[PDB]
Design a protein around this ligand. Structure first.
Ligand SMILES: N[C@@H](CCC(=O)N[C@@H](CS)C(=O)NCC(=O)O)C(=O)O
Length: 110
């Protein structure tokens, strides 16, 4: 394959590839607590990157803006695809559309 054009990009590619569910988050953001919440509800473990605990948080926020079209947290990724923020997470879940997205993630043995 190919390499991203910066460490920011690489990092986002990397963690979004190694993980079914990724939440780029802030510890102080209620929409992030909401999204994390629905995932705990489902019983899906996920990877969190707290951008306010990261020395490069602002640069990562910029990269997520370029990739996903919004800089707001949370930026939620299922199976390499950004599904949007907290309301999207919540709303997909309420419509029973989320668990299927999660179920498309390759299985442990693969
Ligand atoms: N509609 C968005 C709203 C999320 C949101 O407003 N996050 C706030 C903090 S809770 C934010 O991005 N502030 C700008 C920033 O943190 O840089 C969603 O559901 O995720």
């Amino acid at each position: 394959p190919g390499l991203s054009s910066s460490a920011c990009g690489q990092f986002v590619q990397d963690i979004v590839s190694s993980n079914c569910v990724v939440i780029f988050s802030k510890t102080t953001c209620p929409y992030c607590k909401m999204a994390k919440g629905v995932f705990n509800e489902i019983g899906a473990t996920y990877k969190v990157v707290e951008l306010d605990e990261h020395n490069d948080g602002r640069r990562l926020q910029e990269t997520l803006a370029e990739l996903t079209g919004a800089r707001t947290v949370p930026r939620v990724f299922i199976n390499g695809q950004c599904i949007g923020g907290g309301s999207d997470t919540k709303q997909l879940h309420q419509q029973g559309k989320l668990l299927p997205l999660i179920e498309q993630c390759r299985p442990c043995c693969l």
